[PDB]
């Protein structure tokens, strides 16, 4: 009965689509919405394993809904939920402050912090339609 | 549900992206163990689809096209011929390898190569939506 749109990957209770263009974290966050969705939010390890597997045959950077203004602020998913501990370790430019803030992206397996103005791909998601 | 989880539901087919990287024959069997077959392109819409689907990668991905030597035309697994004006096969089309000549798609273009070379594959099987 179509749990999800064509061109999307269906997993568990969510669906994923891979960012066509390569823009800053903001445009990436907009585009996910225009498609009635939100940037990737990892809740479990299985989630991480699903994604990594889905981009293992790549080496480009993909944006996720994790970010912050500066180190005095914690890492928060778009919806405001914190980064559940023991999921992965954020690396990269973890000790800085940029006008646009800091945003985490996953690449070749690991997660990295970075200046959100810098363009990159991303992953979007939205609950799977399970109503026949 | 049209397709299984982890696949990509497109048009009337479902698409999965190989996990392992082996040669055409083995790659062909992995699509079989999943009630499917190697990618078959029937139009450019299909090609454009698969292209975008693997834009984020630089690896080579097998499809169901192959041939013994240039004396033979390219054929899809099902045995049907390659429709004209879909894409032209770049690559080593002069050579003739002992285990056949297989076609893979990489960074937009379709290349011919020794069939016994490791590369990821793309599987497909009728969707679901009666």
Curated annotation (Swiss-Prot), chain A:
Domain C-type lectin per the UniProt entry, residue ranges: 11-125
Posttranslational mods: The intrachain disulfide-bonds prevent N-glycosylation at some sites.
Disulfide bond sites: 4-15, 32-124, 103-116
Effect of residue 89 to N: Does not affect subcellular location but displays a reduced affinity for acetylated LDL (AcLDL). Abolishes binding to acetylated LDL (AcLDL)
Effect of residue 10 to A: Abolishes binding to acetylated LDL (AcLDL), probably due to inappropriate homodimerization
Site, as annotated: Not glycosylated: 43
Tissue-specificity statement: Expressed at high level in endothelial cells and vascular-rich organs such as placenta, lung, liver and brain, aortic intima, bone marrow, spinal cord and substantia nigra. Also expressed at the surface of dendritic cells. Widely expressed at intermediate and low level.
Effect seen on changing residue 53 to L: Impairs binding to acetylated LDL (AcLDL)
Variant or mutagenesis effect after changing residue 116 to S: Abolishes sorting into the cell surface and binding to acetylated LDL (AcLDL) while increasing N-glycosylation
Stretches in topological domain Extracellular: 2-132
Effect ascribed to mutating residue 15 to S: Abolishes sorting into the cell surface and binding to acetylated LDL (AcLDL) while increasing N-glycosylation
Consequence of substituting residue 100 to A: Impairs binding to acetylated LDL (AcLDL)
Location of the protein in the cell: Cell membrane; Membrane raft; Secreted
Swiss-Prot/TrEMBL induction comment: By inflammatory cytokines such as TNF, IFNG/IFN-gamma, IL6/interleukin-6 and by pathological conditions such as hyperlipidemia, hypertension and diabetes mellitus. Up-regulated in atherosclerotic lesions, by oxLDL, reactive oxygen species and fluid shear stress, suggesting that it may participate in amplification of oxLDL-induced vascular dysfunction.
Result of changing residue 4 to S: Abolishes sorting into the cell surface and binding to acetylated LDL (AcLDL) while increasing N-glycosylation
Domain notes: The cytoplasmic region is required for subcellular sorting on the cell surface.
Pathology linked to this chain's protein: Independent association genetic studies have implicated OLR1 gene variants in myocardial infarction susceptibility. OLR1 may be involved in Alzheimer disease (AD). Involvement in AD is however unclear: according to some authors, variations in OLR1 modify the risk of AD. While according to others they do not.
Known function: Receptor that mediates the recognition, internalization and degradation of oxidatively modified low density lipoprotein (oxLDL) by vascular endothelial cells. OxLDL is a marker of atherosclerosis that induces vascular endothelial cell activation and dysfunction, resulting in pro-inflammatory responses, pro-oxidative conditions and apoptosis. (Microbial infection) May serve as a receptor for adhesin A variant 3 (nadA) of N.meningitidis.
Known partners and oligomeric status: Homodimer; disulfide-linked. May form a hexamer composed of 3 homodimers. Interacts with HSP70.
Name of protein: Oxidized low-density lipoprotein receptor 1
Residues of the full protein shown: 142 to 272 of 273
UniProtKB/Swiss-Prot annotation, chain B:
Record annotation: effect of changing residue 14 to S: Abolishes sorting into the cell surface and binding to acetylated LDL (AcLDL) while increasing N-glycosylation
Region of the whole protein represented: 142 to 271 of 273
Free-text function comment from the UniProt entry: Receptor that mediates the recognition, internalization and degradation of oxidatively modified low density lipoprotein (oxLDL) by vascular endothelial cells. OxLDL is a marker of atherosclerosis that induces vascular endothelial cell activation and dysfunction, resulting in pro-inflammatory responses, pro-oxidative conditions and apoptosis.
Residue spans, topological domain Extracellular: 1-130
Post-translational modification: The intrachain disulfide-bonds prevent N-glycosylation at some sites.
UniProt note on tissues of expression: Expressed at high level in endothelial cells and vascular-rich organs such as placenta, lung, liver and brain, aortic intima, bone marrow, spinal cord and substantia nigra. Also expressed at the surface of dendritic cells. Widely expressed at intermediate and low level.
Effect of mutating residue 88 to N: Does not affect subcellular location but displays a reduced affinity for acetylated LDL (AcLDL). Abolishes binding to acetylated LDL (AcLDL)
Associated clinical condition: Independent association genetic studies have implicated OLR1 gene variants in myocardial infarction susceptibility. OLR1 may be involved in Alzheimer disease (AD). Involvement in AD is however unclear: according to some authors, variations in OLR1 modify the risk of AD. While according to others they do not.
Effect of residue 26 to N: Myocardial infarction susceptibility
Organism field: Homo sapiens
Start and end residues of each C-type lectin domain: 10-124
Name assigned to this protein: Oxidized low-density lipoprotein receptor 1
Outcome of mutating residue 68 to N: Does not affect binding to acetylated LDL (AcLDL)
Sites marked Not glycosylated: 42
């Amino acid at each position: 009965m179509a749990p999800c749109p064509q061109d999307w990957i269906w997993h568990g209770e969510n669906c994923y689509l891979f960012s066509s263009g390569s823009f800053n974290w903001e445009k990436s966050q907009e585009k996910c919405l225009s498609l009635d969705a939100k940037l990737l939010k990892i809740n479990s390890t299985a989630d991480l394993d699903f994604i990594q597997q889905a981009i293992s045959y790549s080496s480009f950077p993909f944006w996720m809904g994790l970010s912050r203004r500066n180190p005095s602020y914690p890492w928060l998913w778009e919806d405001g939920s914190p980064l559940m501990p023991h999921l992965f370790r954020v690396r990269g430019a973890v000790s800085q402050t940029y006008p646009s803030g800091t945003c985490a992206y996953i690449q070749r397996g690991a997660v990295y912090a970075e200046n959100c103005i810098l363009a990159a791909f991303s992953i979007c998601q939205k609950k799977a339609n399970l109503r026949a």
